[PDB]
Design a protein around this motif. Structure first.
Motif, PDB file in Angstrom:
ATOM      1  N   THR B   2      48.741  41.726  30.121  1.00 52.72           N
ATOM      2  CA  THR B   2      49.624  40.589  30.261  1.00 52.72           C
ATOM      3  C   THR B   2      49.052  39.228  31.126  1.00 52.72           C
ATOM      4  OG1 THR B   2      51.505  41.606  29.634  1.00 52.72           O
ATOM      5  CG2 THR B   2      51.738  39.758  31.411  1.00 52.72           C
ATOM      6  N   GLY B   3      48.723  40.093  32.125  1.00 55.02           N
ATOM      7  CA  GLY B   3      47.962  39.011  33.178  1.00 55.02           C
ATOM      8  C   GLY B   3      46.814  38.024  32.718  1.00 55.02           C
ATOM      9  N   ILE B   4      46.283  37.315  33.745  1.00 55.90           N
ATOM     10  CA  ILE B   4      45.262  36.404  33.318  1.00 55.90           C
ATOM     11  C   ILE B   4      44.070  37.356  32.654  1.00 55.90           C
ATOM     12  CG2 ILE B   4      43.800  34.629  34.113  1.00 55.90           C
ATOM     13  CD1 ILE B   4      45.867  33.347  35.539  1.00 55.90           C
ATOM     14  N   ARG B   5      43.734  38.556  33.272  1.00 51.38           N
ATOM     15  CA  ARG B   5      42.967  39.321  32.677  1.00 51.38           C
ATOM     16  C   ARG B   5      42.681  39.424  30.867  1.00 51.38           C
ATOM     17  NH1 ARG B   5      39.976  43.892  35.503  1.00 51.38           N
ATOM     18  NH2 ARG B   5      39.763  45.797  34.026  1.00 51.38           N
ATOM     19  N   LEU B  10      36.123  37.167  33.354  1.00 45.80           N
ATOM     20  CA  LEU B  10      35.426  37.066  34.716  1.00 45.80           C
ATOM     21  C   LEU B  10      33.919  37.140  34.489  1.00 45.80           C
ATOM     22  CD1 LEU B  10      34.890  36.896  37.458  1.00 45.80           C
ATOM     23  CD2 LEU B  10      35.365  39.214  37.984  1.00 45.80           C
ATOM     24  N   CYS B  11      33.066  36.289  34.835  1.00 44.75           N
ATOM     25  CA  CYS B  11      31.733  36.175  34.823  1.00 44.75           C
ATOM     26  C   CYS B  11      30.997  35.530  35.818  1.00 44.75           C
ATOM     27  CB  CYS B  11      31.342  35.921  33.144  1.00 44.75           C
ATOM     28  SG  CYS B  11      32.413  34.640  32.710  1.00 44.75           S
TER      29      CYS B  11
END
Lengths: 53, 52, 53
Positions: B2-5, B10-11
């Motif tokens: 649900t989160g931004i994940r 991420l990189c």
């Protein structure tokens, strides 16, 4: 006819047998640039109707 | 889940901000590649080579 | 080679022997319309680089 038809233009491809070229005054790009000082009874026209040149 | 994940990634950084490429064009000396239309509008010449 | 070269496209004329087709992602018109839901590791590209279609 046979090999004698070919009506060619720069890279645009082979056209065969009669086609049509147009002599027109009201063509917008022309006016501004060529026949500015002329009039409808004696003008210049670009017969190449290709948008890119 | 649900989160931004979820919708983000991420990189690694990279200062350059993004390897972008450029296109060569030699309109007056080389045949215009397959589907390219021949023109005079500098911003649309045919392309003969691409490079980073 | 002889008659076997011809690399043809719609009306744009005959090109002969090797040429170049380009597979690119960053092509602006494409993004918006085709690979919206995709990503750089699996996308669609229009290989026809003709401004008019």
């Amino acid at each position: 006819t046979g090999g004698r038809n070919s009506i060619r233009y720069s890279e645009l491809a082979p056209l065969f047998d009669t086609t049509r070229v147009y002599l027109v005054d009201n063509k917008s790009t022309d006016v501004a640039s060529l026949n500015y000082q002329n009039d409808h009874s004696n003008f210049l026209t670009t017969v190449i109707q290709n948008n890119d040149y | 889940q649900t989160g931004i994940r979820s919708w983000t990634l991420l990189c690694t950084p990279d200062v350059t901000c993004g390897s972008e490429q450029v296109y060569w064009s030699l309109p007056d000396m080389m045949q215009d590649p397959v589907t390219f239309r021949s023109t005079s509008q500098i911003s649309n010449f045919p392309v003969v080579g691409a490079e980073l």
